[PDB]
Amino acid sequence: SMQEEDTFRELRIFLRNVTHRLAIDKRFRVFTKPVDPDEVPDYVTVIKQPMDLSSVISKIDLHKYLTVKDYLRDIDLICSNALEYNPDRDPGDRLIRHRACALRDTAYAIIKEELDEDFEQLCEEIQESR
């Protein structure tokens, strides 16, 4: 229905806003674009499902997220990829993992404060009906 389409549009608007707020945070710069294979040639062989905040915006605009849960799976993937690709005690690895964790915790904290649970439940019930 039109009302359901309005619901998913409202979802996309919310997701774009959250994603922008993550993308402008200096700590999360490393997560804002896909890894450049020229810079990091073994990346795509170790990490099977790359994800970044630019790709997240593209996916919002492609209507790939019909729930906040779906979105958070991609935020989680950004974080888990960083953890897997940079697992060493070295400070470069530790910094990125700390930032990856902060990206994830920040997204979740925003959503906890700003997403109405009934709005999410509505999205989920529309998605389930399709």
Q: Nearest CA to 84 among 46, 53, 49, 54?
A: 46
Domain positions in the chain are 1-130
Residue 66 CA to residue 59 CA, distance in Å, equals: 11
Count CB atoms within 10 A of the CB of residue 36.
9
- CA–centroid distance for 10 within its chain: 17
Method used to solve the structure: X-ray
User: Six-digit token pair at 107?
Assistant: 């997204």
| Number of C-beta neighbours around residue 122 at 10 A | 17
Cα–Cα distance measured from residue 58 to residue 47, given in angstroms and rounded to the nearest whole number: 20
Correct CATH for 1-130 of 1.10.150.240, 1.20.920.10, 1.10.260.30, 1.20.120.1200: 1.20.920.10
Resolution (A): 1.8
